[PDB]
Amino acid sequence: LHAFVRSPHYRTIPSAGPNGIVVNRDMLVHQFRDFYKTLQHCSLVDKVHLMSERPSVEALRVADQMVSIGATFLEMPLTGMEHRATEFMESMRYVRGAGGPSTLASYLQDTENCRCNSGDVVCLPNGIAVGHGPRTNAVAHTTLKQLFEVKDDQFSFDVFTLEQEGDAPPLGDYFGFAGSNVLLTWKDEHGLLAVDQYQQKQPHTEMNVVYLEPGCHFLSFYGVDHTIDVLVQKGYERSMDSIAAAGLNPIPVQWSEMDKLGISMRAAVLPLKFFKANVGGMLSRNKSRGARWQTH
Amino acid sequence: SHLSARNIATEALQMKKLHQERGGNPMLAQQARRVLFATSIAGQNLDARSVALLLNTAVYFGMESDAKLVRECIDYCLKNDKLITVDVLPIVVTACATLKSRDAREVIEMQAQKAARNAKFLDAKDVTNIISAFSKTGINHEKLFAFLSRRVQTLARVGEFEAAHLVILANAFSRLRYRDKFLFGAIARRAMSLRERVTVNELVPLIVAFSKIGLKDPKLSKRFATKAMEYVDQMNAEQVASMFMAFAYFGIRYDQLFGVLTNRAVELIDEFNAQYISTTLNAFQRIGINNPELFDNLAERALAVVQDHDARDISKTVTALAHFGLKDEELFKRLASHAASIADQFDAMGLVNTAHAFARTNFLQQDMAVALSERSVYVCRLLDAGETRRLLWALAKFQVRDPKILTPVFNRCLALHYDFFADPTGSEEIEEIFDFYGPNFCPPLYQLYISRG
Amino acid sequence: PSALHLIFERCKLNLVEFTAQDVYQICTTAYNMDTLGMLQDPDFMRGLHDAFRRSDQTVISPFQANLIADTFRKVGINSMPKEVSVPEEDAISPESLILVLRNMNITKQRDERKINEVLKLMFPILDEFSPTQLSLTVTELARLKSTNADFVGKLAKRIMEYNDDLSALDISSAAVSLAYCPGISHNILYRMMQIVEERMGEFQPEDYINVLHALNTLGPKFVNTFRKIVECGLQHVENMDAVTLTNYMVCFSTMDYKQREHIDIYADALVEVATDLSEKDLVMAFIALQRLRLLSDTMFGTMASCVIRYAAKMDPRNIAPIMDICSTVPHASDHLMKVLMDRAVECTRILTANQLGDILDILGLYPPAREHPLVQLFGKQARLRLDLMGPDALANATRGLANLGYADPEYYAQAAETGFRYGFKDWTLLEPMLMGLSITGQCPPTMVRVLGSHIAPMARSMSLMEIERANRYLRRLGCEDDFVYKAMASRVLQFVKEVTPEMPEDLQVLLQR
Amino acid sequence: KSYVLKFLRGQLPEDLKDVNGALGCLYGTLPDVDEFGQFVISPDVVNSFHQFGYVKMPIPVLDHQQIDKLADEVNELANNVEHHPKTERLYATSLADLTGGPLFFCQGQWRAAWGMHDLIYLPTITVAASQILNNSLVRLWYDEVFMKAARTGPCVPWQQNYARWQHTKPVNHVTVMIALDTMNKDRGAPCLVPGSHRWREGGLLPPVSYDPTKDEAHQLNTIWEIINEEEGEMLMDTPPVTVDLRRGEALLIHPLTLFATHGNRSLDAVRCCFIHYMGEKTYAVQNGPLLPHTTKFQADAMIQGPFYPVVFDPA
RNA sequence: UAUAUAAUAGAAUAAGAUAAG
RNA sequence: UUUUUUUUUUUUUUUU
């Protein structure tokens, strides 16, 4: 598991946020340094790769390029990001240099009018959930159903459509999974609606649901590899207690300047899984898991 | 011991490490040389890592470019260029640094182009190793250095490097003569952000590198001086002389640090060797500080041990003593008699410095003068006009008058007559030279000299 | 033998004009019969090698030149066949560039510039290739580890076009060679796998092996083809080779096959004939069985018994996996474990840093390894190898040596200095060093200061139990820096906001300081 | 001393003479001071040398792998497309004009090559050389290598070794010839007079004039031109003898024995090494250096220094 | 009625002073 | 602690 982050260009950081909130450049670089340190200390990411600065502030959103669905690294369409083509090529060069995939799957770049946005895709036990809304029309949903939905026994990979209102952030911002069967959402209309919809879609599975303060950006490295850490914003302390009570490990992270700039912790990193291409029917070495000699 | 080529390269690298940073045991070097003499990779297939390790260990242990193992490794590096990734690039570059064949130059240039192309995708380890390896080859690829400096600055803005990495980076970027004030400022900031994680052993080399690079900013030197003043008590003679040299290189007149350093130096006067004494005297000459009690102590210690004096040490010591004015009687005799024995080790400029220092102090010994004069025929080719003038004046004061020795010096003078006759100083020196040698010894230089140019 | 002696003398003095074919014939008769002292006589072989080096080796096949070089190397003469140049403009034919590549592959001397040159003289004349020539050049390019994916993709498209003209072996070889190429496109791979599964009813065991290798290399993105081959091969499971069953196990582990019904059948078939496996195949079968959670009470015993006959002469790179398998499994493996420890004791000289670290780590918590004589030898060897250890191998070795009770303050101090030279990024890369130091409980104050300065930033991402362990280590070492304890108490406050005496004594002491 | 950089702490000195002893290459290392007794030559060999002026050692002095290494080093010395490193460390080389020729000769190789440096300190040949010189000290003077062409290697005319060594005062010398290849009368085996070392009570025959533009017959037949009638009477009974040498065979030659080398008419090159050992109490004749760029001696100063190292010292 | 064939791969790993323009 | 990066450049008039 490799995490890719981009250093912020100090000179071109905007003076004021999108709404009008002023920001501090020095505090921004300090918080990015702390974020890089606490991402290195995750004890699950094998290596953290730092990208060179680019003369843009929206290039910090390195997660608007790719979605990892199952075992495929799907590429998001270039519809409103025509100025980020070279940025995407440079990021792909960084991924190639780290031993990742040579290129990406173009299943969405060729479909007509397939306007999709990352973050609307949230992983879940043997499936994904996509958010129907302003940034993701029905053609993306039906293409994803065609490509990934499987309704067979012992091989089911089901994708769920979660309709959301027209003034909601990406589904990955306020909806996520963590630990062994733990769910995290914001305590507002969007979180309750998404939780209820997923309860209807998967009724026979009972799940732990944890409610967080609205506007509290979090990040959990959910996947096949079991983990317990959940990065959470430092300002909110009720959410930290809620996460700790569920049996998970919370890690406070200072993220005020990005919040003033509109960049979430989820959209600032690009987690990827690279598996060594075994040649000749061989198996590589895994990581030391479990306790050795339980019975001595 | 019969082993596979990879299993031989691993032990070769271990032997290199033990002989390099764990005492230079001659038996380890002899065993490694014997093992590598019979090693060949003509048939067996190996990774790029194993071949690079074998080449590096062979080159380190004195093997030149004429050996079979070196030729095979260089052939592998030339053919399979795409298998030499960034991980195994610095090893190959460091191995090829000493080699000066055509294949070595081609390999170094190809690795330089590869590193300059991929300079934005490296990490702290790879960047540090690459810049350290390219420091040793003497290459002059400024675009690569700029790319690596930019990557260093961006990677250190997030607090990635540490003490050893900073020391290696500063040494590599100072040896290559890259006066990038922003890069060294970033390195200094990263060092000062490493509170109490930069020990004395990791602080002295940083100061030495920052002094050698020659930074115009004088505010930076103050912080290094204060941190050294805090750390004086935990030092041996090596680091005391090292900071004498470093703060002589800075050129700022500090008072408290110099006093405490002199106190610690006179404390450890029983541990000083020839090189430390020479370095201290040279540093005092460079900074101009006159300290006669310390000079007396250093002169007495240098009198105590004279066999350890190398040609560089001898030259620095005699030049410092002659410039300061203080000079002993028997110490000079011992130094001259010793330099007569090792006259075949002086460099192009060390020989000139030693001869001129002995001539300027009016100390003439026949054995030393004869040895230096006879040796001054293989070094006249590598002499600048000022050094040639100094050597010629030393010979004139020595009264050699030997054509076999004089004609190369006069050939060098004629081949550099513009820089010889237009020196802002030394006019009286040339006048005395020509007074001694007369007009008929060398006509053309006389004709030029009576024309003033 | 006057005539034989005269012939040998004339050959020794380099007075006989030898052709490459004559040298090949002499090498063949010397390597096959060897009734005379040809190979035992050094001078005659030196003269023959001198004749072969100056000869014209274009008139012999790459196999013949390779055999000549092998015969010369068997006696001590370092021989290497000449490198053939790229054919000139007239001799540019589809059957000659393939010959260049084949000789480059056989003689094991690859030049990438020559590969590029013959890949740029193949594109204009690529329309003259026979259907089998494409399937040959694909495998030749794959075996040379070429990074040119566009050329291989074009070749694969052409191979797909001449589908009906190719045998099953050619299709399987093309599929596996395509799978070995890293940069090739995925649509071509999907088309090739569809082609393979359409012509899949004619496969020999060799084609099964090639297809399984291709699937294992490709990964879990191609589950449907593996499902098809599993469903087809269920008829042949009882009458099947052991190697292909092991490859089935490896593919089962790789794809994470959720259909655990056929896995039992294939695993039972493999364990029936597991006696006919070599080192690597047996090790791979062990790993695949462990990762599929199949180690039962009886099959583990049979596989261990099979391993026993191999454990005496195992390679140093095949000792750690078996140790890990024994460690994870809760069954009885004392005899195998002892044999493996003896083999590791024998191999301690040639073990690299990573293998030594893994061996020490697996045996960290093993009770019988406490008194076994490997502890001192491995400690000394690790001290010697400490210069070559990496950030993780050093941590593994330190953890293994600390858990075994090996006490040597010099080794732990040197490990601390090496770690300070490398730097730490996880708590798991710093804790073994701390417990190793706490074993002796003594270190210079500068070491304590550096360790505390490393620990303090890391205290914001530690669980409460890990905070307890870190506090124990710091108290044992004797630290006095206040900011470290401040950060530790700040982290502790979040988990237990109450200062009530409910928490143990160490926690109150920590928050007090 | 000075400070050596970390990546230069294993390098050997520019001049290999600076190494006090012998490197570990080729044979392992020199034995103990009391373990040199197993290399003594038989008294019959000494008597044969004193009677004939030459003798071949009973056994080869180098194993085959060492011979391959030495041949490879000789090949690398004669490189032309990429000139050998430390070329300027030789007394004289045949590639000083960068062109070359059918015969390649290299002098002073021991300062610019591994293995060749260790060949000087071989106990098997040094002990025998010391035994030849009345069991005394031995000092290396210089060594050379000859490599003949593939099919047009020229033949060295008749020669006496001492004809050029006029700077050394007494007749105290010995020559060791090592054959790195297999030699013959058609390939470069040495042909020498069985008894020329005791002619004219130790005098030297005048230099022989040869035409370098013709075949081997006149080159080998100039011996009659250079000798007198009585020397012809001695020569007629015992004609010159060509000794065929295999790999590793060593030949001890007196400095006053007339010897020549046949040309190369085989199908490849042939290489041979000559090493010239003095003894103790060997003095100079004139002022100045004996060899180019060497130590300058006095009129009758004893020969010593780093250019002429001591390779074996009894007692 | 002929003198001759030759292809299986495994390992992730950092030392540090040149008498300058 | 805030300075900087991303071309197929090809036009130098000597008798060396």
PDB file of N, CA, C and O in Angstrom, chain C residues 10 78 103 123 128 132 160 199 202 206 216 252 260 334 336 341 370 402 406 415 472 505:
ATOM      1  N   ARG C  10      51.205 -31.583 -31.947  1.00  0.00           N
ATOM      2  CA  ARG C  10      50.915 -30.615 -32.999  1.00  0.00           C
ATOM      3  C   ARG C  10      49.705 -29.759 -32.656  1.00  0.00           C
ATOM      4  O   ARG C  10      49.638 -28.592 -33.061  1.00  0.00           O
ATOM      5  N   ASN C  78      38.204 -20.104 -19.116  1.00  0.00           N
ATOM      6  CA  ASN C  78      37.102 -19.150 -19.196  1.00  0.00           C
ATOM      7  C   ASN C  78      36.847 -18.827 -20.662  1.00  0.00           C
ATOM      8  O   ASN C  78      37.564 -18.030 -21.270  1.00  0.00           O
ATOM      9  N   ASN C 103      20.222 -16.667 -30.794  1.00  0.00           N
ATOM     10  CA  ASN C 103      21.601 -16.820 -30.343  1.00  0.00           C
ATOM     11  C   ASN C 103      21.861 -15.973 -29.107  1.00  0.00           C
ATOM     12  O   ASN C 103      22.572 -16.401 -28.190  1.00  0.00           O
ATOM     13  N   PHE C 123      10.017  -4.083 -37.931  1.00  0.00           N
ATOM     14  CA  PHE C 123       8.724  -3.447 -38.172  1.00  0.00           C
ATOM     15  C   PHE C 123       8.389  -3.309 -39.653  1.00  0.00           C
ATOM     16  O   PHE C 123       7.272  -3.689 -40.044  1.00  0.00           O
ATOM     17  N   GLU C 128       5.990 -10.172 -43.457  1.00  0.00           N
ATOM     18  CA  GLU C 128       6.519 -11.374 -44.084  1.00  0.00           C
ATOM     19  C   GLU C 128       6.683 -12.528 -43.103  1.00  0.00           C
ATOM     20  O   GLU C 128       7.297 -13.540 -43.452  1.00  0.00           O
ATOM     21  N   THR C 132       3.984 -19.201 -37.235  1.00  0.00           N
ATOM     22  CA  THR C 132       4.806 -19.738 -36.158  1.00  0.00           C
ATOM     23  C   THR C 132       5.970 -18.817 -35.814  1.00  0.00           C
ATOM     24  O   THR C 132       6.438 -18.813 -34.669  1.00  0.00           O
ATOM     25  N   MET C 160      -3.199 -13.348 -33.134  1.00  0.00           N
ATOM     26  CA  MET C 160      -4.645 -13.524 -33.088  1.00  0.00           C
ATOM     27  C   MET C 160      -5.234 -13.637 -34.488  1.00  0.00           C
ATOM     28  O   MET C 160      -6.199 -14.380 -34.696  1.00  0.00           O
ATOM     29  N   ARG C 199      -9.953 -22.615 -27.359  1.00  0.00           N
ATOM     30  CA  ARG C 199      -9.173 -23.766 -27.810  1.00  0.00           C
ATOM     31  C   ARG C 199      -8.551 -24.511 -26.639  1.00  0.00           C
ATOM     32  O   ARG C 199      -7.417 -24.992 -26.718  1.00  0.00           O
ATOM     33  N   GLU C 202      -7.893 -29.022 -25.976  1.00  0.00           N
ATOM     34  CA  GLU C 202      -6.817 -29.792 -26.587  1.00  0.00           C
ATOM     35  C   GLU C 202      -5.519 -29.709 -25.794  1.00  0.00           C
ATOM     36  O   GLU C 202      -4.474 -30.152 -26.284  1.00  0.00           O
ATOM     37  N   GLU C 206       1.776 -29.587 -20.455  1.00  0.00           N
ATOM     38  CA  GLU C 206       2.657 -28.439 -20.651  1.00  0.00           C
ATOM     39  C   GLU C 206       1.857 -27.166 -20.901  1.00  0.00           C
ATOM     40  O   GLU C 206       2.182 -26.097 -20.365  1.00  0.00           O
ATOM     41  N   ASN C 216      -1.270 -16.842 -12.983  1.00  0.00           N
ATOM     42  CA  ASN C 216      -0.651 -16.418 -11.732  1.00  0.00           C
ATOM     43  C   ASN C 216       0.063 -15.084 -11.898  1.00  0.00           C
ATOM     44  O   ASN C 216       0.002 -14.224 -11.011  1.00  0.00           O
ATOM     45  N   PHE C 252      -4.849 -20.836  -6.886  1.00  0.00           N
ATOM     46  CA  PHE C 252      -5.927 -20.748  -5.906  1.00  0.00           C
ATOM     47  C   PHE C 252      -5.599 -19.724  -4.830  1.00  0.00           C
ATOM     48  O   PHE C 252      -6.461 -18.934  -4.428  1.00  0.00           O
ATOM     49  N   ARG C 260     -14.782 -23.035  -2.244  1.00  0.00           N
ATOM     50  CA  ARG C 260     -13.958 -23.955  -1.471  1.00  0.00           C
ATOM     51  C   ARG C 260     -14.350 -25.416  -1.655  1.00  0.00           C
ATOM     52  O   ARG C 260     -13.885 -26.264  -0.884  1.00  0.00           O
ATOM     53  N   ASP C 334       8.249 -30.396  16.033  1.00  0.00           N
ATOM     54  CA  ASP C 334       9.499 -30.236  16.773  1.00  0.00           C
ATOM     55  C   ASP C 334      10.687 -30.814  16.010  1.00  0.00           C
ATOM     56  O   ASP C 334      11.757 -30.197  15.948  1.00  0.00           O
ATOM     57  N   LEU C 336      11.083 -31.465  12.681  1.00  0.00           N
ATOM     58  CA  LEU C 336      11.377 -30.643  11.514  1.00  0.00           C
ATOM     59  C   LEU C 336      12.018 -29.327  11.929  1.00  0.00           C
ATOM     60  O   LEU C 336      12.956 -28.849  11.280  1.00  0.00           O
ATOM     61  N   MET C 341      16.772 -25.774  12.292  1.00  0.00           N
ATOM     62  CA  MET C 341      17.734 -24.993  13.069  1.00  0.00           C
ATOM     63  C   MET C 341      19.156 -25.495  12.853  1.00  0.00           C
ATOM     64  O   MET C 341      20.093 -24.695  12.767  1.00  0.00           O
ATOM     65  N   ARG C 370      15.861 -21.124  22.834  1.00  0.00           N
ATOM     66  CA  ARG C 370      16.537 -20.387  23.896  1.00  0.00           C
ATOM     67  C   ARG C 370      17.893 -21.003  24.221  1.00  0.00           C
ATOM     68  O   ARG C 370      18.897 -20.293  24.345  1.00  0.00           O
ATOM     69  N   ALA C 402      16.621  -9.942  20.888  1.00  0.00           N
ATOM     70  CA  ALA C 402      16.134  -9.513  22.194  1.00  0.00           C
ATOM     71  C   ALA C 402      15.155 -10.524  22.776  1.00  0.00           C
ATOM     72  O   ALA C 402      15.159 -10.771  23.988  1.00  0.00           O
ATOM     73  N   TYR C 406      19.570 -12.981  24.112  1.00  0.00           N
ATOM     74  CA  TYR C 406      20.973 -12.734  23.800  1.00  0.00           C
ATOM     75  C   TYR C 406      21.380 -11.369  24.338  1.00  0.00           C
ATOM     76  O   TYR C 406      20.825 -10.343  23.931  1.00  0.00           O
ATOM     77  N   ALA C 415      23.554  -1.237  16.929  1.00  0.00           N
ATOM     78  CA  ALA C 415      22.253  -1.203  16.273  1.00  0.00           C
ATOM     79  C   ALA C 415      21.578   0.149  16.464  1.00  0.00           C
ATOM     80  O   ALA C 415      20.923   0.656  15.550  1.00  0.00           O
ATOM     81  N   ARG C 472       7.473   1.874  29.938  1.00  0.00           N
ATOM     82  CA  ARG C 472       8.311   0.886  30.613  1.00  0.00           C
ATOM     83  C   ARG C 472       9.739   0.927  30.083  1.00  0.00           C
ATOM     84  O   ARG C 472      10.705   0.943  30.858  1.00  0.00           O
ATOM     85  N   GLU C 505      -0.975   2.088  38.461  1.00  0.00           N
ATOM     86  CA  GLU C 505      -0.032   3.023  39.068  1.00  0.00           C
ATOM     87  C   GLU C 505       0.819   3.735  38.021  1.00  0.00           C
ATOM     88  O   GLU C 505       1.063   4.945  38.119  1.00  0.00           O
TER      89      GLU C 505
END
